[PDB]
């Protein structure tokens, strides 16, 4: 079935994958070096073996899209996806007054209270946000996130680069070209960022009419992330070619360090005993063709029939 | 044997290559994403189908470790790689006083005689660059190649930073990172440079002491380049562990469009007829571990007994 690279990616790990200690407390199973090939035209790549909020997925690629960098948007989506990356610098900022927080997704879930602390800061984080402007474009804006470095990459001439809007244009009047890239790492930024590009680059390419793009993931999460992330770009091809007047084709996701979490390993067991489903289909807007301005309502998801969530303790 | 992935790849774009016409009249075959695996463990992946010169491939690797952009260091070893690309800039600056030289390399290989004043004309622009300082700082220098891009990325604040230098130190210093990027990519300068960098951006990778390196390549020609390519990195990798004391695992070729110009055809079908001999190794001065200091005489190549070398005609 579709889907089926990323289960034999999960059963590979688990075989053959090396035991990898990292940067939180929560040791891995990793490899280095794995490709996904994903063909577009049997279906939308969302896992039916488990149940992916396919909303998350576009309410962030149009954020994305729209060159926007404020959480505001995502909070006016329900989506709670980077949250957290905003609120700890609210923690830090002189401020901010109430308790410590002090790497507070560890603690999260090892202290009972503290956890409901945590939610209820989490609460007030996000509701002035929605609410009091000021407050959203000072910690609401993560300034260096896909956005901006996808839509507004800024030049040593202190201006700003729209790598995606060209790389569109490009395709429109060059497809055969070999340099539709586009680039999240910026050498400059990366030393000191919190969270450098897990998507670090990605490519487009024409033939025969049909529109492929490959991923390179730095490091992925195999249980968690990557059901996520394959959506999120089998769908961005979708829109680049509903733009560009161009049939789909495939989806190449490949992968530097690619990994999962020892707490993961139980769930994605029972995953890979679960049969999966003839996979859905997304319906684009047939009138709109400028995916910027695309919304919500403009992208649609059909005959999805997943099994039922599988929960898991996310890592820290 | 070692190099069979190389033969897999050209024996898979003559089966199913689509014909895709490019920027150069020469039409071709290529594929969008692949992945190559190599053992290091193994021997060094040098091509035993076909006598690659070894020699320039250390003599362009150090220049790149040296963070060296002036084609002087290459002619200065025989090296005449990067040539046309400063010689290109020199029969375009309003200094240079003879034929006209327009697009040199397609009037090369059609028209005879214009052939020899080329090869003339390139003999006093390699021989003033040896030896004339001045115009060697002038034309000789390329500016935007990987040996800046590696060691002397210009960011917004107008310094400059040493990507390979700490990279290294980063393995040195937290191995199990997986963040171990170095990128060729600059959307400033893509737009207009002349031959933007087809080996986009590479990884590196710890585990179990075994160093691995990753490498992206947006484009690939795959009877001349790819046995280079595949040289570069894996001794680059050689380079890094040398250095990182660490032990050498594997290299990591991935590919966006992998292709074959169609005047290659019978020439790499005369190569796949060829069995592949025993791989060659590599030997590092055991003594010197400072790579970026490294010199030609610190890198030898040992049972390298290749098959007779295959002349084909360059793609324009
Ligand atoms: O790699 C990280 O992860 C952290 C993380 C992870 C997911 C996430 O959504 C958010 Cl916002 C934050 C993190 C968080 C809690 C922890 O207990 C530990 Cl150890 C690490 C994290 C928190 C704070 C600063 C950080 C700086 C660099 C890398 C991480 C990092
Ligand atoms: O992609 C290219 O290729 C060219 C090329 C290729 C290999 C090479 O080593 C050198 Cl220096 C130059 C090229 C050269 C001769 C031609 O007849 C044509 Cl059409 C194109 C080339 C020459 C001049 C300017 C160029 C600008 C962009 C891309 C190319 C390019």
Chains 1, 2 share one sequence.
């Not at 889907?3 to 994958?17: F, H, N, R, S, W």
């Not at 794995?34 to 790549?45: A, N, T, V």
């Not at 896909?146 to 507004?152: C, D, T």
Request: glycine content about 6%; charged content about 25%; hydrophobic content about 35%.
């Amino acid at each position: 079935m579709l889907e089926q690279p990323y289960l034999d990616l999960a059963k590979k790990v688990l075989d053959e994958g090396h035991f990898k200690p990292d940067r939180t407390h929560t040791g891995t199973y990793s490899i280095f070096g794995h490709q996904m090939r994903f063909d577009l035209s049997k279906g939308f790549p969302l896992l039916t073996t488990k149940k992916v909020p396919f909303g998350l997925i576009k309410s962030e690629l149009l954020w994305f899209l729209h060159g926007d960098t404020n959480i505001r948007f995502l909070l006016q989506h329900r989506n709670h996806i980077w949250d957290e990356w905003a609120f700890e610098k609210w923690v830090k900022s002189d401020e901010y007054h109430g308790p410590d927080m002090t790497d507070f997704g560890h603690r999260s879930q090892k202290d009972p209270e503290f956890a409901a602390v945590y939610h209820e800061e989490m609460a007030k984080f996000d509701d002035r946000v929605l609410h009091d402007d000021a407050f959203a474009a000072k910690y609401g804006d993560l300034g260096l996130v896909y956005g901006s470095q996808w839509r507004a990459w800024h030049t040593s001439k202190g201006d700003t680069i729209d790598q995606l809007g060209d790389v569109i244009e490009q395709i429109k009047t060059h497809p055969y070209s070999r340099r539709l890239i586009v680039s999240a790492w910026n050498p400059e930024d990366v030393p000191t960022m919190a969270l450098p590009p897990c998507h670090t680059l990605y490519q487009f390419y024409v033939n025969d009419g049909k529109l492929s793009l490959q991923l390179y993931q730095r490091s992925a999460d195999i249980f968690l992330g990557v059901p996520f992330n394959i959506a999120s770009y089998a769908l961005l091809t979708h829109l680049v070619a509903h733009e560009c007047g161009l049939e789909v084709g495939e989806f190449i996701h490949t992968f530097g360090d690619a990994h999962l979490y020892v707490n993961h390993l139980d769930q994605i067991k029972e995953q890979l005993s679960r049969t999966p489903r003839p996979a859905p289909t997304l319906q684009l807007n047939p009138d709109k063709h400028d995916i910027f301005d695309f919304d919500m309502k403009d992208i649609k998801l059909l005959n999805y029939d997943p099994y039922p969530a599988i929960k898991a303790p996310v890592a820290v």
